[PDB]
Amino acid sequence: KRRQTNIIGVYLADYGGSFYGELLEGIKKGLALFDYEMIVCSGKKSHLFIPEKMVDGAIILDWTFPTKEIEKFAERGHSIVVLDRTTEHRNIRQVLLDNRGGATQAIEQFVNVGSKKVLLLSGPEKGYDSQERLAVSTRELTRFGIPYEIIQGDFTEPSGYAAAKKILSQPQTEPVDVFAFNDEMAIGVYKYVAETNYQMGKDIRIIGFDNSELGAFVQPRLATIAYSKHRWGMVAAEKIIHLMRGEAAESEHIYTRFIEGESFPS
Amino acid sequence: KRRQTNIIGVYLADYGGSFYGELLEGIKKGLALFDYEMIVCSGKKSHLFIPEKMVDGAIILDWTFPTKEIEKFAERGHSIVVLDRTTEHRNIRQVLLDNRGGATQAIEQFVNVGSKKVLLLSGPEKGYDSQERLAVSTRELTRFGIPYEIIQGDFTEPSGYAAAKKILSQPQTEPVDVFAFNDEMAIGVYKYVAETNYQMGKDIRIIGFDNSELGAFVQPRLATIAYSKHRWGMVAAEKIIHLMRGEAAESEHIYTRFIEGESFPS
């Protein structure tokens, strides 16, 4: 009520730096049209100090930012767009990835190639994006009679590295088939395989998610699920303006496509 | 005096995401040993709201964060490590890149190949790192009788793109020789050259700075100036602890090396 700073706080988790740059650019461009600016905050304790007397509204992409804290910030008059979870609270809207369509498109490729086992390298289990990706992956693998193992990660590259070390210790099937829930965990897998006799694409077949630009230039090209990161940010920016101006700001999804790569010969 | 939150505020500019991840990991690891944690803030207006009642000290890598604001935060009892400028104020220390040695090593390669003109794609002119890099580059080019043009950028990839469009409009020398002051501006040059008949390494020869991992996988490999980003962060973290504990925390430099790449056949 008493303040309009024309600043949106953007709360990131700092795994997703493989898509953050182009997401942030889209947020920036969308906000500039309405003379708004953005500050970006990241860290485990970043939700403890929200400058609520200095920020008009928030765009949240951080699974460690607790939902109860989001609701409390919404009830004090601040508008919020979540990019990482679903909500029913007033003053909050959603701009989410189509995780169900993305995971279906990736897991379809393992089916179409006749996979004998699929290893599901997931992110945080309390995180919505991984939950949706898991619910659809496991359902389709069951449907087609394909066994799976779920390996816990945290969306960061170190967890993908540790996963690959855990995977390639135990005896696996002839090719090792991996669905990494993001490109960063997949790059972590590349890192460890570079320290082994294993050949990427041949001995270990991988599909990621996010379409990081590093994945496009790595050897061989990381097969992945792509979406427009610029538009994700643009739509989030327009949604936060419309929402705080009392207007119609319906929750939306960002749709995906599979991009083929020699890391998964299909 | 009245608070110890065990949190360090890290103020970044959000160009340098090509080195931020490994810099931040080094900060994190160095701080965890002393049971400290970090929050990261970025944006043009991020210095206007410093949670001074919620953060013990600051690590600054942001040229838009004004020096006068840094001094004011230092005089209120907070300890600061700068990674982007020099200081003489008490409560502030420096952990800086060896810009003079880095620019000397890059510009030596243009000399050794017998360059006819060197195009100097700089960052922000008020930014210390670019100033030092420019002062050493221009001095050595003059010394060896090599002409130069200084082209203004801002350390971000869009400015490298715009620079390449400006460069390749005007008639230049037989190979176009470019010293990009960071890898991101160099990647911007790659982007535009991919939309032209020009061949990277042959028609346009480039050396960057930072040793981004994208530069290692791009075609051809971006010749660059490398330093340990992990250690830059580690030393900054140990310096902020020592400084706020009243101890001896001398200002230091992070030293560099040239890494050869087929973008500059030498």
Domains of chain A, residue spans: 1-98+227-256, 99-226+257-266
Fold for domain B99-226+257-266? Rossmann fold (3.40.50)
CB A171 within 8 A of CB A111: no
Q: Which residue of A has its CA nearest to B214?
A: A214
Question: Looking at the partner chain, which of A20, A39, A214 has a beta carbon nearest the beta carbon of B214?
Answer: A214
- Substitution target in A39, A56, A154 with the highest count of B β-carbons within 10 Å is A39
Cα A90 to Cα A98: distance, rounded to the nearest angstrom:
22
Say if strands B7-12 and B37-42 run parallel, antiparallel, or are unpaired: parallel
- B1-98+227-256 maps to which CATH number? 3.40.50.2300
* DSSP secondary structure of A76-137: TT-EEEESSS---STTEEEEEE-HHHHHHHHHHHHHHTT-S-EEEEE--TTSHHHHHHHHHH
CA–CA distances in Å: residue A22 to residues A29, A59, A132, A211, B149: 11, 15, 24, 11, 31
Dig out the tokens for B2 from the structure.
Answer: 């009245």
From chain A, pick out residues whose CB is under 8 angstroms from the CB of B37. Answer: 43-45
Query: How long, in residues, is chain B?
Result: 266
* Of A213, A178, A173, the residue nearest A192 (C-alpha): A178
Q: Does B219 touch chain A (CB under 8 A)?
A: yes
B1-98+227-256 and B99-226+257-266: same fold? yes
Cα A58 to Cα A42: distance, rounded to the nearest angstrom:
13
Describe the crossing of helices A157-167 and A183-193 by its angle, rounded to 10 degrees: 50
Q: Does B43 touch chain A (CB under 8 A)?
A: yes
Residues 126-185 of A with CB under 8 A from B: none
Contact B39 A43 (CB under 8 A): yes
Query: How long, in residues, is chain A?
Result: 266
Q: Does B49 touch chain A (CB under 8 A)?
A: yes
- Substitution target in A40, A53, A183 with the highest count of B β-carbons within 10 Å is A40
- Substitution target in B8, B44, B45 with the highest count of A β-carbons within 10 Å is B45
CB A252 within 8 A of CB A240: no
Q: What kind of experiment solved this structure?
A: X-ray
Q: Which residue of A has its CA nearest to B24?
A: A14
Backbone φ and ψ for B120, nearest 5 degrees, come out as: -105, 100
Quoted resolution (Å): 2.4
Q: What is the DSSP letter of A175?
A: S
- Substitution target in A14, A62, A263 with the highest count of B β-carbons within 10 Å is A14
Cα A239 to Cα A232: distance, rounded to the nearest angstrom:
11
Q: Does A250 touch chain B (CB under 8 A)?
A: no
Q: Mention every residue, 6+ apart, whose C-beta is less than 8 A from residue B31.
A: B8, B37, B38, B237, B240, B241
Dig out the tokens for A197 from the structure.
Answer: 């006799």
Assign B56 to helix, strand or coil: coil
CB B178 within 8 A of CB B161: no
Say if strands A92-97 and A118-122 run parallel, antiparallel, or are unpaired: unpaired
Q: Mention every residue, 6+ apart, whose C-beta is less than 8 A from residue B246.
A: none
Number of CB pairs, chain A paired with chain B, less than 8 A apart:
62
Per-residue H/E/C for A35-50: CCEEEEEECCCCCCCC
Question: Looking at the partner chain, which of B14, B20, B40 has a beta carbon nearest the beta carbon of A43?
Answer: B40
From chain A, pick out residues whose CB is under 8 angstroms from the CB of B7. Answer: 45
Q: Looking up tokens 């279906």, which residue turns up?
A: A104
Q: Does B68 touch chain A (CB under 8 A)?
A: no
Q: Which residue of A has its CA nearest to B52?
A: A49
Question: Looking at the partner chain, which of B37, B43, B214 has a beta carbon nearest the beta carbon of A45?
Answer: B37
Q: Does A7 touch chain B (CB under 8 A)?
A: yes
From chain B, pick out residues whose CB is under 8 angstroms from the CB of A55. Answer: 49
Assign A202 to helix, strand or coil: coil
Q: How many CA atoms lie within 13 A of A264 on its CB side?
A: 29
Cα A236 to Cα A251: distance, rounded to the nearest angstrom:
10
Contact A214 B218 (CB under 8 A): no
User: What is the least distance, in Å, from the CA of A190 to any CA of chain B?
Assistant: 13
Question: Looking at the partner chain, which of B37, B42, B213 has a beta carbon nearest the beta carbon of A39?
Answer: B42
